[PDB]
Amino acid sequence: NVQQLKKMAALKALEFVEDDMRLGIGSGSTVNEFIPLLGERVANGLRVTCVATSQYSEQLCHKFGVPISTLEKIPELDLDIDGADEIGPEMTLIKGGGGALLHEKIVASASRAMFVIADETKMVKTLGAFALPIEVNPFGIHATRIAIEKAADNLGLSGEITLRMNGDDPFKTDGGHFIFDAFWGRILQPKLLSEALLAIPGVVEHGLFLGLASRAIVAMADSQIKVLEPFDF
Amino acid sequence: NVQQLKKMAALKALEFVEDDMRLGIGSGSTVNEFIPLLGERVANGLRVTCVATSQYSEQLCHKFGVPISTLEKIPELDLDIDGADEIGPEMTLIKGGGGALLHEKIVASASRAMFVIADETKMVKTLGAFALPIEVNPFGIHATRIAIEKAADNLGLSGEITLRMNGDDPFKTDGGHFIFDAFWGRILQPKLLSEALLAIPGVVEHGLFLGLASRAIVAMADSQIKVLEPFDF
Ligand SMILES: O=C(CO)C(O)[C@H](O)COP(=O)(O)O
Ligand SMILES: O=C(CO)C(O)[C@H](O)COP(=O)(O)O
Ligand SMILES: [Cl-]
Ligand SMILES: [K+]
Ligand SMILES: [K+]
């Protein structure tokens, strides 16, 4: 069902991939359907060099013969292909549910275009039902927590703020950080929330991608695969 | 002679330290004059608990019997005592010459008041002669260098952006990050530049402390010690 929708979305996004392209490769279950398809194309002659955004995306790339490089070697990419936890107005996204948002966000900024692949449930009228992830420094995290609570209060946001755990330890990102998930339910002013969060010293990054996504490739329940632009949101 | 001025600033700031305060302890050569003095007061029965902002400041704290705790234990501090590479209009700071900007800014943020201690030379009419430090993520650092170069162009800034070295190994901060020093020479729009840099995914933080300092204690070559407020800048 959704796995079907994800694969459909992935197949269609794959049509925009051309020879000698440098690609950003995102993370999550939808991108995991895209990587092997890409590898099948590479085994049939397609030339690409990819930058992965997580260890599991990188693993899959190696496994399926997708050539892998780094942003040190290729600082500017042609196209980024990634998923999203949510796609809202102007194709603002929430990402980071799998914990890879930092590398994902850096890779998206380094790309001439970012295409989002998704099944229709990711499309929302308003952002926020999916808890916003917020990458934070371990040092002074308690004070960073208080600062995010107070910023939430000022902006009229309500909901638990939870430290993401891996069993008994905090979950630690690739960049060596921790993550807070903020269950704010509705984010009406994402540009203001993003500015307020980034200004907090202990906040490394957050999962609101604003004006980064250029196309959303969304597979619908009725089998339509729509190629959408930010004006469609 | 400037060492004298540093001590004079430190002695004066020490007078605002009262029994049972929770103190932030900054870093730098000026703060290195303050810690032993504080230690000498502790020997005499003054009671304080300090959060240090660098390894060297913590080392000096232990060496002089200044008690040490964490933001985890004490999330909100009464008073932060720190130096500054520059003190400009509205008491905006540039900090991070010694490499400790992130922990310094988290601590500053977590305090009720922040006191800057400085010799006369740090007061500037316009910020920017001192290279602005920018803490960045190692992942995608090349891409981040480019995005900073682009943000600079948009704000009309020019100059070399060099990576902080410690040997022929990039200097790694306590947060596990690298630092770019931006030799822009002049920064007339510090708030816009702050907003811009923080929006760049790989930028963890930077050395512009805006509306964080509440008093500057500045020792002048004529022996005056001025206790100054942001209204005085
Ligand atoms: O990288 C991600 C999280 O770090 C995502 O792409 C996001 O979580 C969406 O994943 P999915 O494709 O499983 O919906
Ligand atoms: O921690 C600092 C740099 O990280 C500072 O306090 C700033 O660099 C001022 O240094 P100094 O007092 O040595 O002139
Ligand atoms: Cl092909
Ligand atoms: K920040
Ligand atoms: K950032």
Curated annotation (Swiss-Prot), chains A, B:
Which pathway does UniProt place it in?
Answer: Carbohydrate degradation; pentose phosphate pathway; D-ribose 5-phosphate from D-ribulose 5-phosphate (non-oxidative stage): step 1/1
According to the record's subunit comment, the protein's assembly and interactions are: Homodimer.
**This protein's name:** Ribose-5-phosphate isomerase A
List, alphabetically, the HAMAP family matched. Answer: Rib_5P_isom_A
**Coding gene?**
rpiA
Which Gene Ontology terms cover its molecular function?
ribose-5-phosphate isomerase activity
Give the UniProt keywords, A-Z.
Isomerase
Q: Which residues form the active site?
A: E104
Biological role: Catalyzes the reversible conversion of ribose-5-phosphate to ribulose 5-phosphate.
Q: Which GO terms describe its biological process?
A: D-ribose metabolic process; pentose-phosphate shunt, non-oxidative branch
Which residues participate in substrate binding?
S27, G28, S29, T30, D82, G83, A84, D85, K95, G96, G97, G98, K122
State which Enzyme Commission number(s) the record gives. 5.3.1.6
Gene3D superfamilies cross-referenced by the UniProt entry: 3.30.70.260, 3.40.50.1360
Recorded catalytic reaction(s): these are:
aldehydo-D-ribose 5-phosphate = D-ribulose 5-phosphate
> Which Pfam families does its entry note?
Rib_5-P_isom_A (PF06026)
Q: Which GO terms describe its cellular component?
A: cytosol
Protein family per UniProt = Belongs to the ribose 5-phosphate isomerase family.
Q: What class of enzyme is it?
A: isomerase
